[PDB]
Amino acid sequence: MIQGVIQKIAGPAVIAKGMLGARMYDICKVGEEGLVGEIIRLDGDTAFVQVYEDTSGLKVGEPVVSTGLPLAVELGPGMLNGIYDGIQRPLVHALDREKKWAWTPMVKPGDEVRGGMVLGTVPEFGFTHKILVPPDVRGRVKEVKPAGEYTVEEPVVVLEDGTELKMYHTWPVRRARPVQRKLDPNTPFLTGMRILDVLFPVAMGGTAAIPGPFGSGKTVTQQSLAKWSNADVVVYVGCGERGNEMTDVLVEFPELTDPKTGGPLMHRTVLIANTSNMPVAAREASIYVGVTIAEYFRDQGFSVALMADSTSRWAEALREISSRLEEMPAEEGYPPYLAARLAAFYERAGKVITLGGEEGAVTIVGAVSPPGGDMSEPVTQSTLRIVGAFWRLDASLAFRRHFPAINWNGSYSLFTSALDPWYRENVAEDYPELRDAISELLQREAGLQEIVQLVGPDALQDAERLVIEVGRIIREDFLQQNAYHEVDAYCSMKKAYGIMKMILAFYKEAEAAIKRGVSIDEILQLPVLERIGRARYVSEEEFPAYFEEAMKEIQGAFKAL
Amino acid sequence: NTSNMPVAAREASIYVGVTIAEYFRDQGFSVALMADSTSRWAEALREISSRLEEMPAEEGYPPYLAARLAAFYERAGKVITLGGEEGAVTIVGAVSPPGGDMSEPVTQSTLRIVGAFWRLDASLAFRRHFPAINWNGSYSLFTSA
Amino acid sequence: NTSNMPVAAREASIYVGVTIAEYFRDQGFSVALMADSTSRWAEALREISSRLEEMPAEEGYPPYLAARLAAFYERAGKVITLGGEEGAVTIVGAVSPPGGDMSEPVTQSTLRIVGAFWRLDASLAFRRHFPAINWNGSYSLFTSA
Amino acid sequence: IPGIRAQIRFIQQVLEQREREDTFRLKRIKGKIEARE
Amino acid sequence: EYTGITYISGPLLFVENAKDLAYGAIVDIKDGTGRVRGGQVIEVSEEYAVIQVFEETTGLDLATTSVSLVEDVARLGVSKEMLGRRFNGIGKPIDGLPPITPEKRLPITGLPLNPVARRKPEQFIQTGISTIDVMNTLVRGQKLPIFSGSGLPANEIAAQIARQATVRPKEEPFAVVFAAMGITQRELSYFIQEFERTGALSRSVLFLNKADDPTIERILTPRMALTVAEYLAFEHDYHVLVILTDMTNYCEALREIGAAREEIPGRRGYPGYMYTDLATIYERAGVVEGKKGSVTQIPILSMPDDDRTHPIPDLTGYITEGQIQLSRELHRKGIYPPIDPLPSLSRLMNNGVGKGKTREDHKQVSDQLYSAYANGVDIRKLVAIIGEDALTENDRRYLQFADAFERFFINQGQQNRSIEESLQIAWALLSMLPQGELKRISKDHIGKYY
Amino acid sequence: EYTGITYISGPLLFVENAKDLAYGAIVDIKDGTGRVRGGQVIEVSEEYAVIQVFEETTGLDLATTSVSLVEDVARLGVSKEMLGRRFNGIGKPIDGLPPITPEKRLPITGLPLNPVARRKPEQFIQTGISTIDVMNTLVRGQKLPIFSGSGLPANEIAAQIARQATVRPKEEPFAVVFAAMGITQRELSYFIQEFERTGALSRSVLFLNKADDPTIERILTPRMALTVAEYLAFEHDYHVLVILTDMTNYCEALREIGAAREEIPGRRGYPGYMYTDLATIYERAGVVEGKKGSVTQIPILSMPDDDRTHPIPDLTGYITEGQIQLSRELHRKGIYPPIDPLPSLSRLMNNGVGKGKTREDHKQVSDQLYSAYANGVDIRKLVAIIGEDALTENDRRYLQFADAFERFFINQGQQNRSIEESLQIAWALLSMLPQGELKRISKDHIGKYY
Amino acid sequence: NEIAAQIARQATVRPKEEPFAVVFAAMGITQRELSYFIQEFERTGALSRSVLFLNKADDPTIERILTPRMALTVAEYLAFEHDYHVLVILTDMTNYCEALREIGAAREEIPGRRGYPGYMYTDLATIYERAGVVEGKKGSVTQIPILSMPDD
Ligand SMILES: Nc1ncnc2c1ncn2[C@@H]1O[C@H](COP(=O)(O)OP(=O)(O)O)[C@@H](O)[C@H]1O
Incomplete structure (x- = not known):
């Protein structure tokens, strides 16, 4: 009765269990039928268990057994291209026991090692997997395998004369993997999308919330980022799936390609599904399983992106578990415990100096789905308070066919200054000044449109008409990006600034021409404008040539007067 | 259905009437069921529900009302009575929102069931246009029928 | 009435004060009773009631509050004291709703008893109009008197 | 100027929509806590 | 084995068993009733007592009344012969024909078959409606909701698709599953007559749930329909189109019982479980294993009170590959079909269009x-602000284009437009715009198609 | 004395003692745990059982598990050497330095010392921020909240005051106590680095509570901070400035446990005790006995959902002597600091201004x-109503004054303005108004200062 | 209340063969208001044809609930058994409601909108149902209830 127990009663979704004297609070327990449950209530004469599935498969007298884990994950060769679920297992094992991997020794007998040290390399999937000494293990390498082929279970090394090490390791998804230190936001996560990279930057290891109503394009921002962002690995927690969003990804993504290599994107991805038939428990643990896998890859020295479809549904699954445990409901009936937990999750994001030096990072992009436009609790409210970045897909911007549909007035990044130096040193000296100038343009447009909504546009001076003209070019030629175009699907950093300078240079020239009594109507039909409009489709620098083409054309307008 | 009568009786009044109505159509008669009104019936039902401590929703009305009201109007229709012969019960229900709001209870749920709506318009009445039925806001989903 | 003091003491504080107030008016003095505030007194009373397991109502306040609060304000008045002579107790009570809602406890029940209300208006204050008393939302029942 | 009152009128009713109905999912939730307890 | 009622509160009945407790989900039968009264086990309370939910009224029940355990829940009499029949929400005949002769008896929750493949929706379904086929193409395996409101002809559209849909040269046979929930007797008679007269019934299974049918039967209706679709698609290799009207009415019934079940309500009075029950329905769609068949859904989502942000319609959006949103305002302008051209999307549209599917342009x-x-719709606002005469020549063209789009592209005189026909109308109306203003059409397409 | 757990529900644990019951507030220690697990006694249930609240997770607890009574509550290792150290919410080192060497061990609830005098707050605290020092002067002993919302730089302001604050010629030494609650690891690393780099750490005690630290540790954080402040002020005669961010986050944790404690919820789901717990924190400020020292508070109150009427921020207003309210609307207009000039007040402002303090005008x-x-802000509304050109000449001046106030007085290019500098800018902008329209400035001041 | 008192002083049934009477009921009024109403009825001689029921703010809440019922019963008696046209003036119904609402909580009911008793409309119906012509058609009961808007 220490390691196992027997069902006393079941109905109303809680299983009461006699025994399980050594079970931990929040441990997964296993019913004979094969269902799993979570130990929620420990009482003097029973354990109350939340069942992660249908309780009719549970009867009084049924045997229940401990698992000993809040949970764990396997971390070694065989993770890439793999499709798991909330608790890691083929969509059951986790890592192939038969698959052979080419292990390459990166340490000699006599070397002194510490947790995080790299002892070997495995080209499991290009990616090159980095075999590390499990956290909390140090000493002297007394034995190490030679360059050959081995299965996961095999021992490749021994430390301190007997701890045995393999190519994989296990880790509690609930416990954030150790690290020496977390570094300050310094390097931008080059998205390739002009509005993001320019106005609402995400830093490598930053937490930037994606929030807005259903069908605004939240997931799509995430998917484009994975197809084109500068992270080597992606950890997609395709939660809030329904109707067929499961099968929509089941046989679809296995075909999506890596724009960078022309190989399957899954070849550098880990999927974590959260379907409706799955217990609230699994979906709750899914972000923790993902973040742990994410932290694992950054430990190798990779920059990984963690995309969380979504936390609104995770908080609903958690509220279901809490209410079943009879915890006191608060606002919208959510338990009090949620805010600290959600924050703790986002805190595990960041670019670090991994164990044994080297730098890696986990950038988090979380989807926000309020109950319906209310944009309050759970999701939005608590999230927008943590995250440093928010890209507001705007349904009105979408209906107007302005893509990406990111509202340049309601979106924000707290990382703008954090990443500006990376852009200034590696891309362009005028990155920050350019995005500030474009944003002031968009800001001015917003104010002008509010007034025009009242007094009409007929009274507008030429100066104000010019600002709307250029503001419109920014929205159509820059903010809007075509995810479906083979070229504009990804916009390299170098291309983003060059397009910005074409627009900003057209602005200066526009304001300069007006100041010299050039009719705005003359500028509005300037031939270069149509080329500036198709610039996002050009894959060659022929784009910066537009600056000189713009200047001469204005001169031809200074000529005619 | 007077005010001194329990909410219970007024609640049951439409069911007693419809049953009597269905009884006459069974003979092969075409009967008209005129319900003064369902706004007051839903207020009597909300009183009973709140006294029973059922959870209040919009305007404090119980969740159960929409399915019930629909079930009532569903008993309307021209049928082939037991042993052949045709008869029918046509229902005309009065709608009295709390005051012009024309939301819940009455109107909202009713206008979603009923196939016909004859909108008496106070402005048409003040203008001495009789019947004061607004030919722009009224509808019959029976025109083609 | 500090926070470290039991809900009991703060509850009794208005009664201890009013009694002392009535005592001075008995001498033939006109006394002013200023009650900072009754919102906090009703919160202290709700704490005592909930601990006694009395059934919570609106905002979880016990049913008993309205009659009690009224009974307090009823002890106000200018009288002909025992052995002739006139004295009086005028009450000025502070109102602090949970936050602008201006509902329960404090405001709602109080504004129904009191004959006078001087509405300090934050917008009048920001505008530097002092006293910041809203001459449109304030009222007294004594002009003709 | 009857433009003001016009579309801006849509204004007051999405505003008013928003909460005598929202403020109510709520007088009633809290009932609901120890209304349910 | 037999039990005795120990408590009754509305739809919830507690039942104590001295021997053998019935497992959760079992159907129990109340003894001593004129009409069959089923109790579905929901929980084991402890002390040999279970908590149940009644499938019909509990008036007249007494404590101590006897109950038997049937030994099972409820299920679908699966057969290719389901085609050509009209049934209730529970799969009982409504067409005066004999009960289905099952080839297999399938559970209906979605556990049976495990039919879906991990492949993306693809290939064309010709609805015969230009505003779907041309601009918002329905693809095999997709979930493409019709988004509407009370008073709008969403059911006419649903019935028309049921009559017209096909999978143009596919090696696989095509079938329709049409499920209606909480409909009137008049509507039921109409749907029946329509399927029978047109000969659409030959390739369709129809499930009709009436407003006065048990609420539990309404809840089971979409599950009977989806199970039949998955059977035909997986075991017979068919491309099946499932039409479910109205999901909002399904939700009103599910919401109706959540209260009787003891849950604390969520926003707008809805069940706290709204999104994880609704997910059990929208998860059931896509290509099936073998890639010979597929299940496609066209769910109807009426806005309660015309509010697209109500939790029901709002949570449904994620389950779809194409959405067609209908608007009362547009219907009142006489534009039919009353589709909001700036709120209808193809979640999966790009997977069903282009060269080799529709056309490259x-x-x-x-x-x-x-x-x-x-732009044209916004300019209708600008006209109201400034007056028609103050509008620029360029804006006037966009203003006029919005009328042309509504008059000629949206409006169809009932009529099966091929995608070629729909693109032709599209190019014809586009001619109204200055060629210099076609920012979103590459020059290659203008030269070839304009 | 030892007890045994008889019940566990989330953070609430019941514990039965056969001998000696631990009094309310005592810290109990759970035996058999890898990391220290404290249970704070909350109630005596009867039958020798107490009800407690855990300071860390309760996963892995078993009924019958042993518990010891420590004989006291939680406590502060009090010493002047607290200055220069960074600690957790519980006062454990975060700076890799040794644990504090206590001069005294103080209870933290506010009962220790009885430090406060029955004297009014008085004398200047120079924050170095013009919008505080000049217009809303902070006084020694006052509670002057920063009133903000999510997304706004309230923490930047809090950190800047921590770096800059002083008590200009005072015979008494000055110290800062900075407490952060429910912050991210990134924010904690930032605050640490800031205190260390600037040398602000030399005169400060810093308490940092992380989002993932136990909820009970967050509740104790402000009490550790206030106890340290009262010790330094009363026993060492210091003017101490306490900065607490964010009170709303403290409230989210206290609210989180109220449910587990069995209380009927109050408005907005909050604990019924919201105002009498919050009073235990705002009561702790003012001049201390001897009048050599004082405790001043600058609590940060973020509006949840930007709603200043939410019960948390709304109940905090009464605990303050100066309030600085930040507004998202203002921040979105690019006006920083984003202070609402018509909602920021000084309760005690008149006690810190005039001749011999600031200046007579x-x-x-x-x-x-x-x-x-x-007036200028209201006229922005009037401009929207009538148009700019329809505004009178006089109103146009007030309209323009509002922009001037925002551009020149509110906005500071980070910059330590003396009160003389702030009054000069004030007079410079006032010149924009007609002299005949200066109703609130006596003629004596116009002649002398205009 | 000035309007209510003025109607009480002035009301009549111009050439009726039936005698006329007033029933004036006040609920939850101050001592000052009670003294004023008394003095007014006595001075004007309106008291000769009136029955007056006065309930003070500090009188038991149950006595306030019974006040309108005492008043309506007297009116029905005078109208039916004595054949009189009786005018009943009830101020203030809102104050009656504040007392009835005050006890609903102590009675264990789940509150309805705005904190009111769930039974608000079926208790209030017991008072508004009591009016109209009486059998015989010699008398009648007429009501002038005062309804102050809480919070306007
Ligand atoms: N960047 C985009 N470009 C064009 N259409 C888009 C874009 N993002 C979203 N959409 C449209 O919106 C639909 C729903 O987008 P999605 O991201 O899946 O919604 P959600 O916010 O619910 O995750 C897409 O299928 C597409 O039709």
């Missing part, structure tokens, strides 16, 4: 029409 | 700027 034309219509 | 200038800015 399809995406460009769709993008340009959407952009021009949205 | 300070009240008049403050009154006139406030009145002119409020």
